[PDB]
């Protein structure tokens, strides 16, 4: 290849531009991780080894330095430890890992989401290194539950519908909510 400065030490700034544009942050707000960098004031941290970028939680005190970053994106800094995968899951900054359930992929970080043949992406809510054998399904690999594979595109609306107010957000053909119609027809259950 031509020597285009996208490799190694000469690609830090362009990679920071790419990460900032992906995360919607400033280029100066992306930091490369090594042993001793000040992660204060930075908003996204990039792991050179895994080539994965994670949003740094806000409120990191000024002068905080990093010691190690695990392959599960577990960041230990001078003032504590942060699971960057959990932060990315909270911010829905998912990485759709290449492959699917039918082929088998291994999940290193909580934000990694695995595609299935139904078109849905499922994130694992258990265990740092969830391993998925070839030919598996979310039901076969642990099921689809809160402590198991969770569909990501409809996670929040599914959880909100599962609450006590879910029936009230769904309207019927007459302009009344499903909850109102359930309350209207509950006389049958009371009578029975």
């Amino acid at each position: 290849l031509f020597s285009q400065g996208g490799k190694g030490s000469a690609g830090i700034l362009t990679n920071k531009q790419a990460v900032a544009r992906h995360f919607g942050v400033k280029q100066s707000e992306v930091v490369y991780f090594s042993v001793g960098v000040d992660i204060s004031g930075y908003k996204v941290i990039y792991d050179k080894t895994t080539q994965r970028a994670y949003s740094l939680p806000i409120g990191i005190p000024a002068g905080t330095t990093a010691i190690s970053l695990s392959t599960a994106a577990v960041l230990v800094h001078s003032q504590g430890s942060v699971d960057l995968g959990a932060v990315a899951v909270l911010r829905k900054e998912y990485v759709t890992i290449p492959g699917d359930f039918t082929s088998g992929a291994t999940i290193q970080v909580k934000n990694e989401i695995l595609t299935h043949s139904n078109g849905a992406q499922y994130r694992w809510a258990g265990a740092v290194p969830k391993v998925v054998p070839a030919g598996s399904t979310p039901a076969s690999s642990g099921g689809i539950s809160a402590s198991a594979w969770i569909e990501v595109t409809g996670e929040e609306l599914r959880d909100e519908l599962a609450t006590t107010g879910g029936a009230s957000q769904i309207g019927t053909s007459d302009g009344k909510t499903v909850q109102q119609w359930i309350i209207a027809n509950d006389s049958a259950n009371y009578r029975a």
Partner: protein, 69 residues
Amino acid sequence: YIPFVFNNGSAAGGETTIVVPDYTIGVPEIYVEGFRQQVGRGFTFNSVNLTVTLAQPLEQGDEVVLMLS
């Protein structure tokens, strides 16, 4: 070095080899879009044919500045 600009600064695309003028007894450097290339790494210059064999085929509009020795 004498800077030689390939095709007014815009390559026609798919160019693997570049012919330099006679004066050129050597091409120590190639600048593809501001990127310096080293002999044997990004390009090989043969003195017999006066042709620079590039590592990549040039794309349309590529600016290649050839340093002639």
